Design a protein around this ligand. Structure first.
Ligand SMILES: Nc1ncnc2c1ncn2[C@@H]1O[C@H](CSCC[C@H](N)C(=O)O)[C@@H](O)[C@H]1O
Ligand SMILES: Nc1ncnc2c1ncn2[C@@H]1O[C@H](CSCC[C@H](N)C(=O)O)[C@@H](O)[C@H]1O
Ligand SMILES: [Mg+2]
Ligand SMILES: [Mg+2]
Lengths: 190, 204, 62, 259, 55, 204
RNA sequence: AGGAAUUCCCAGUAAGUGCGGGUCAUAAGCUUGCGUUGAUUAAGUCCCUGCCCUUUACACACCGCCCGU
């Protein structure tokens, strides 16, 4: 049999173009699930959350942002509606769009901090792939949450637009601006 | 596109003499400043007062492309609504700042919306993401033309110090520039800064 | 300068002085048989792949 | 189901169902040219402001807004691929927009009056035909920055339609309905007049042989394309502004001058 | 430079156990990079003759 | 060449309350101001205060290319030395003007060189030969490019109103210009005029 | 929608929601049970702020004297 997310989105055609992030994005045949709700224990051990499917990680990270915590079914429906809107607008697999958005949103180097009472000094350092994935998901969720606030637009459309812009690589998205500014600060501080 | 101006190191604080509370001024409160050994001549709200007159009467704010932030020496962040007029004369300006620093907000007498409000530090959280952030200092050897630094369609942040002595040094600026070969006042720096932005952005 | 990929061979330890980043030893994916020491921020283990936009800088230098 | 646009309200009606099953009412003054996509999930709209609006058939607020036009817009349509739109307004220009990118792809300015009837080809993407009151119908098409073919009509053009097979373009102006062939450019095959007022709308049946023409004189003529002669007539109480046909010829919907 | 200085240490015979322990460690960790550089070809030839002879 | 700016209608005068002499301030002397029915709000020395500061602190006045003349509402004509330093605080500024009017003179504390002293009316006699006079007001419907009005090597006189409300109207001005379509302050007009003349004469 | 300062927190944990009892002390706009939903980050250093100890079981291997009044 074939396993499709929500019964309509296939996972076989999804491919990852970044070699570093292949081992930390779980979308392939072993990690294919019908729903982003498994009731697993992925925070029990270090590095175990890299085995969690990325759709479930996006659902979990979308619960902490701007909501009463613990409402997971609502977040699942929001993700489903966002995927439907993405497919309607673009016409390609929303899983590929999410993977491309996460790949593009991840910073490659950050600035480690040396701070005293007077001033702070800087040093550019590298970023591990797990932190890249975590920070990309956090930036996407924060951008969607801030776009949806105080606007006549439900969170699903803002989230869909955020993934579309991030996967396209356009500068209209919050995550791309955050990534560009962080890498620019790290570049100036070498 | 907008201009963000941050007044860093403002000397704004409230003290009590007799039964009255009033803003700390160098000459008016000379006796109490020497008490406890505080350095005289450091309480200068006038620099903050004079600079806001230059900024908010500039046509750039009149066109709606300017936002002003004040970060005082006591680490209190104040946001300024562009719809506000500053008090032009000094004594009532002390009355406003005493009103603001105590009640944490000042409502419009003519409107429901707030005009002055104390907000959460740091100021870097309130800037639009992707904006350029520039510090200003006379000590920079190279004089940079303001017209060249203006972005075409992006917001930008410029930091001007509100002190007679010292250099601007904050965490979030990535370059420090000089725009003249001479030491200028804080009010003149804002007036010279805002005028170049208008003609680039077509505000005449 | 082209973007480089490196593989982590040995995790040395946490710097302490420079925040709390980790000093690691990395070898380039090219068949040049080169190896350098890098500072990495975030949780890292052996076998991870790092993306270096600049590959000339050394973590420990005078 | 069918979408009826009227005043500032676009109503979605089902089969039977006297009351509308859905309503879009957040139009500032009036709405123009509600049209469905080939998948029946999104609909294009127009307004007197000039912004082109994409709507979801299950939502309440538009998904994408296009602000390029300066005056009222009256014709909007999709392309062969379901992800670009072509719009034409009263500022003498016609614009091609991209849906995911949310920006205008291309602009044409080759018309001298109000541009208020656009059509696209299901067979070939970027191949579309536009109509205006300047008595001319220009075919902005291929991948080029100028019109490849133009057609002259003796009266202001109310409606234009494309026959999917054979490259036949039918245009309505005044009483006249003219058929033009694309095998050899600008070839008027048959010009017909069977109405005593202006021909408002022109529609094609599910079968290619039948062609329906509604006009302003409370009469609708059904023709065979093979002979180009009238084969049936319909009489109504008021003037036919809109004529619409369902799958096969199951349902006929006619919208009048009155409500 | 260290390989040149290590060769000078073994010939004198001073603290050969300490230097050889240091010398063998660098060769293993930089084995691939050393092999590529042709400039190091003379260096180990002096090292190879000296080390086994002294030990 | 030299730029001369004349501040007309300045509200500078000295009044008697009790036994001490004070400068006429609207905020401070509201009690006596309401008596005799004289209009509150007209007495506005603060307009003069910040205007002199930026004129004094402008780079041209360092270069010796600025002269400032003061013509008050009381028809008192005041010249300034380029070496003069106007106090930044309003209260310390009020002391000098009170000392100015009564003694008719202000000498340097470190030398006999003359800093501030009242001269004879009219000011037009003191103007250099071969100089044109220009008045500045918002009311002119046509805005003039301030960079266009500069003479290459000739002295030029501008008249800027230091009053609260009214229009500039003096006999010796030859032509009237507007520099912006927004209602500006007397201060920001002074900053704009010095900024424009700065680039033409090559001082940066 | 709550500044400056400041407190607490690592897995069924933070947070939300309901339903009971008043049990020989305490508890009434409060106290204590029980169930429901359920997250982000971290699994390592002594850099700051501190704390606890030391500097007299002879396999192999390793190592080879704390200082002062
Ligand atoms: N020539 C100039 N260019 C840009 N900014 C200037 C300037 N002269 C003074 N300023 C700004 O005006 C403020 C107060 S004037 C105090 C000058 C101070 N000593 C200094 O280091 O520049 C300072 O914060 C400074 O940033
Ligand atoms: N846009 C402008 N151009 C030139 N001078 C101006 C100006 N705006 C104000 N001024 C000058 O500044 C002085 C004070 S402003 C006084 C108010 C008056 N409605 C006005 O806007 O002009 C006036 O004397 C006027 O001459
Ligand atoms: Mg709160
Ligand atoms: Mg409860």
């Amino acid at each position: 049999p074939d396993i499709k997310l929500f019964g309509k989105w296939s996972t076989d055609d999804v491919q990852i173009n970044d070699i570093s992030l292949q081992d930390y994005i779980a979308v392939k045949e072993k990690y294919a699930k019908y729903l982003p709700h498994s009731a697993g224990r992925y925070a029990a051990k270090r590095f175990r959350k890299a085995q969690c499917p990325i759709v479930e990680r996006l659902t979990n990270s979308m619960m902490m942002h701007g909501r009463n915590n613990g409402k997971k079914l609502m977040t699942v429906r929001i993700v489903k509606h966002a995927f439907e809107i993405i497919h309607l607008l673009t016409g390609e697999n929303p899983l590929q769009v999410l993977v491309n958005a996460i790949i593009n949103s991840g910073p490659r180097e950050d600035s480690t901090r040396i701070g005293r009472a007077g001033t702070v000094r800087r040093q550019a350092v590298d970023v591990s792939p797990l932190r890249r994935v975590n920070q990309a998901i956090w930036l996407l969720c924060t951008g969607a949450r801030e776009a949806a606030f105080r606007n006549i637009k439900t969170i699903a459309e803002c989230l869909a637009d955020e993934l579309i812009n991030a996967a396209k690589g356009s500068s209209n998205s919050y995550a791309i601006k955050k990534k560009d500014e962080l890498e620019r600060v790290a570049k100036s501080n070498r | 596109r907008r201009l963000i101006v941050v007044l860093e190191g403002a000397s704004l604080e409230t003290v009590k003499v007799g039964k009255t509370y009033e803003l700390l001024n160098c000459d008016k409160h000379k006796s109490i400043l020497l008490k406890n050994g505080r350095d005289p001549g450091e309480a200068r709200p006038d620099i903050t007062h004079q600079s806001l007159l230059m900024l908010m009467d500039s046509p750039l704010n009149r066109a709606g492309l300017l936002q002003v932030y004040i970060h005082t020496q006591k680490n209190v962040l104040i946001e300024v609504n562009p719809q506000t007029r500053i008090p032009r004369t000094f004594d009532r300006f002390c009355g406003l700042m005493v009103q603001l620093l105590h009640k944490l907000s000042v409502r419009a007498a003519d409107g429901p919306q707030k005009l002055l409000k104390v907000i959460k530090n740091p100021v870097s959280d309130h800037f639009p993401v992707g904006c350029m952030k520039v510090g200003t200092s006379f000590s920079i050897p190279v004089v940079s033309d303001v017209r060249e630094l203006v972005p075409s369609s992006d917001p930008i942040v410029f930091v001007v110090g509100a002190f007679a002595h010292g250099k601007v040094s904050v965490e979030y600026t990535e370059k420090m520039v000089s725009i003249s070969n001479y030491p200028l006042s804080a009010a003149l720096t804002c007036a010279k800064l805002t005028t170049a932005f208008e003609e680039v952005w077509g505000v005449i | 300068q082209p973007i480089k990929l490196a593989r982590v061979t040995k995790v040395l330890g946490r710097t302490g002085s420079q925040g709390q980043c980790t000093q690691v030893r990395v070898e380039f994916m090219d068949d040049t048989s080169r190896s350098i020491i890098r500072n990495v921020k975030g949780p890292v283990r052996e076998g991870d792949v790092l993306t270096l936009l600049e590959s000339e800088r050394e973590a420990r230098r005078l | 189901n069918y979408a009826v646009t009227a005043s500032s309200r676009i109503h979605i009606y089902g089969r039977y169902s006297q009351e509308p099953i859905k309503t879009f009412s957040r139009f500032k003054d009036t709405a123009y040219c509600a049209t469905f996509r080939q998948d029946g999930r999104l609909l294009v709209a127009g307004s007197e402001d000039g912004g082109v609006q994409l709507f979801d058939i299950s939502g309440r607020a538009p998904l994408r807004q296009f602000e390029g036009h300066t005056k009222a817009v009256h014709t909007v349509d999709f392309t062969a691929d379901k992800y670009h739109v072509v719009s034409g307004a009263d500022d003498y220009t016609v614009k091609l927009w991209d849906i995911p990118n949310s920006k205008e792809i291309l602009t044409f300015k080759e018309h001298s009056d109000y541009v208020r009837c656009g059509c696209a080809s299901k067979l070939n993407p970027d191949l579309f035909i536009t109509g205006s009151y300047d008595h001319t119908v220009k075919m902005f098409d291929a991948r080029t920055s100028e019109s490849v073919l133009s057609v002259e009509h003796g009266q202001p053009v109310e409606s234009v339609l494309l026959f999917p097979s054979g490259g036949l373009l039918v245009s309505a102006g005044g009483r006249y309905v003219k058929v033009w062939d694309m095998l050899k450019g600008g070839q008027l095959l048959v010009s017909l007049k069977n109405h005593h007022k202006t021909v408002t709308c022109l529609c094609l049946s599910s079968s290619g042989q039948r062609l329906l023409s509604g006009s302003l004189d409370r009469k609708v003529k059904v023709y065979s394309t093979t002979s180009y002669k009238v084969v049936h007539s319909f009489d109504y109480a008021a003037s036919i502004l809109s004529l619409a046909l369902a799958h096969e010829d199951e349902t006929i919907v006619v919208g009048m001058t009155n409500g | 430079d260290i390989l040149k200085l290590f060769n000078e240490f073994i010939q004198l015979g001073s603290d050969v156990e300490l230097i050889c322990r240091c010398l063998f460690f660098l060769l293993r960790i930089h084995f691939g990079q050393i092999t590529s550089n042709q400039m190091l070809v003379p260096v180990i030839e002096k090292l190879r003759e000296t080390t086994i002879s002294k030990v």
